[PDB]
RNA sequence: UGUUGUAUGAAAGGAGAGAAGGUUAGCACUCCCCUUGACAAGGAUGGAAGAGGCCGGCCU
């Protein structure tokens, strides 16, 4: 709804772990739920 | 209330709020390329 | 007499609802249903009409305009302001809505609201003419100090 | 079509016809509109209270029963109540305790009970009338509804002093011994 | 006696036909007599259905009553006579568990004081 | 939904080719174009096909 | 688990509703029409339980709707297979001897 | 203690069934139905609308 969320976000590898996808246990739990 | 199995059916047979358009500002068309 | 006139209402409505059911598209035709109520001077009809019409397409550019124009015409101002608010909410790149909102905030006489609207716009800072517009705005009133910021 | 116009149409239908059954239907509809509060005035403007009062005078028992039923729900309102009294229909109601049907008698009793006015406006009339003697037999009848009505009627239109005098008169008739008219109960 | 089921019939005829029968204040009661229930042991479902309308003081099935074969007769005591009228008004001639349902007023059963309050409330309503 | 049966085969082909050409018209025309002129482009498509058949 | 009712019950219901023309049965029309969906099942059970030629009367358990809309024969015809085979062999002998001895065998008219 | 809670078919009286000369064949796009067990097929090609802009009107 605001302007600041359409400007390009930082473009570099500040945090490899933060972008990494969740572990196998969480995805198996969500798979079983669904 | 109990319903007997024999009866047939009895009755004859806005979207989600609009998301804001988050767009780059439009570039107006030049007369040359509008001729194109 | 009068009964004939309500019959006139009803048959024109019936054929219009057929026309509307046929496509649900055709925005130019959507406006006509509304204006015919505007002639009939009963607005609640047109408020539901334009609500449905915004449901089909809010992306549209004439529709939000036309709605607010009917609002202005009917001299009812609080809803006109509020729904220009919602317009600028969901179409924040279209310049015209911003212009026709602040112009309105002037001629209706409420200085601060325009100020806040201008501040909100300062997020986007989308075009060159808009800034100039606000410069002229600020020189219109006693204030040159804000104009420096 | 229009409510009051519809009631007027029923009035016309009643007046022009002569078939007793097509009058049975009219007196049914009229007696059941008489139950309506709002339709009272509409009935008050069309002389149909006197239509009922004339209709009791007719000798078709079913029709008379219907007329009495119409009266029963109709009398209790103060305007209508006063009109009926002024007509002089009270002896017409009095004639109905000897009517053969149970319903008609009950309706008559209810109408009599309704005609009761505070401040002793009409009670005096009942004591003079022999209706009280008839009531004693009715109260001790086999019909539970009749018994309830008779007992209720006694409280509403009678007095303890009056009841004792009434009982004595009834007893005297059974006794077969005459009571002087001049003699009267003395307050203590 | 008065429980007999009268029969229907221009007079600006309505949608549903009505039998010729005038209702007097005395005729109407708060005791409602229901006859024609199928003998399939629905004692409680019928009573719940009627309790939907008002509040039921007392309900019992009176078996002495002469009824037809495999058919039942019941009594319902309501709390307010207007509730009894609406219960008749809507429940009468409603198909119930495969049977036609016939509700009639039962004034015989009500006692002297009950008649007193009935008549007095009729006077109260008519005056206003 | 109705299936595509032998009656409906050719009309369905034209119906789908029509829709796909329309999609590419929308993605091809520059932003803020004064007019769409889509119906005219589809008229030129028809005339091209008719000229193919007539050599 | 209820108790079977006397046959007079269903006989009286079927008798009363006959032809479904009385104005009193207006609400049973919907249920009769709704019960049409199961009438092939009722036909299947009826013909499945037909009496064998050596028995005069067969009495079957019946499950019937309370308005009289449909009646199901609620059983399965279980037989002992040797006894069953012997009974139809008995019929083979009797029917053959009867076709031999009956001078003129008249076949019944259909329908 | 009534009334607009609607529809089908028929009869009578009227209108008359697409194709820029005539006679016609159809299949669809949307939304309105009818027959039908329909993911089929029919109901006149089932019927009814169909370029752009401005406020039924006006302009190309
Ligand atoms: O005038 C009609 C009807 O309006 C009136 N009536 C029905 N229910 C009533 C009620 O609760 N109170 C009063 N005062 N009047 C009422 O009576 C006649 C005819 O009644 P119907 O609609 O035929 O119903 P019903 O009287 O029950 O018919 P019946 O043969 O007796 O039994 C089903
Ligand atoms: K079509
Ligand atoms: K054709
Ligand atoms: Mg077709
Ligand atoms: Mg043809």
PDB file of C-alpha atoms in Angstrom, chain G residues 105-111:
ATOM      1  CA  UNK G 105     -53.589 -77.960 -21.593  1.00  0.00           C
ATOM      2  CA  UNK G 106     -54.845 -74.429 -21.755  1.00  0.00           C
ATOM      3  CA  UNK G 107     -52.269 -71.716 -21.235  1.00  0.00           C
ATOM      4  CA  UNK G 108     -53.385 -68.564 -19.499  1.00  0.00           C
ATOM      5  CA  UNK G 109     -53.904 -65.259 -21.286  1.00  0.00           C
ATOM      6  CA  UNK G 110     -51.345 -62.446 -20.992  1.00  0.00           C
ATOM      7  CA  UNK G 111     -51.686 -59.771 -19.697  1.00  0.00           C
TER       8      UNK G 111
END
